[PDB]
């Protein structure tokens, strides 16, 4: 398991404008 990505998942957003 990847702790960093598990954490990032809570607030991930794509590169949109």
């Amino acid at each position, epitope marked *: 398991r990847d702790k960093k990505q598990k*954490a990032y998942a809570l607030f*991930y957003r794509p590169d949109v*404008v």
Partner: antibody
Amino acid sequence: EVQLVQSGAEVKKPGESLKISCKGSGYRFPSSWIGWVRQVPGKGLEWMGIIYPGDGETRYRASFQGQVTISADQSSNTAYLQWSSLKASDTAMYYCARHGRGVREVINAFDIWGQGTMVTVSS
Amino acid sequence: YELTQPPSVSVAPGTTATITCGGVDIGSTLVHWYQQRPGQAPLLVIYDDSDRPSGIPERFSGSNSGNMATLTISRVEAGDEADYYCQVWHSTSAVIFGGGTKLTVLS
């Protein structure tokens, strides 16, 4: 240079409305979260909400739901925090801060902070 | 969900300062640490448990595990005294700061 510049100090009375702003400079504004943090003078930091301007996604702490509104405008690179009916307890400093979008190429934390806006609500 | 910090911590110059942040299973998520000086906006000093921003000196480091995270300042200098806050992203709608800790470097 990456920078967040907030609006000047505010002195309001209870029951009034207010809208303070935080402008980003030196980076691509839509591709980073901007969060708002409250700090009563001499007390700790309290997180209120956060907004991603790219798609406008907005989250609030459960306490502040219906108490404030967070917004953003990409054409002007500006996030906003607004009260409809200010109350004395809202007196505090307010910071805006940039937070990464959950990717390794960026810092996924409040890596940049505005200088803060002092809001004084007294009758 | 609360993060528990000690209100105040004092250490001698040139020694190691440690500030502790307590949270339920805090070791499962990432912990960040911010330094705030009187009259100034916070400054990210450590992110993702132990990472240092480019400008921060190597004296700052972080740890996280179980129900305890830690900020460690080695060879602490007088200039380092300030308020320090731990912070995590617990739930989707809840970002949580610690109560804050006042660090004094004994003079």
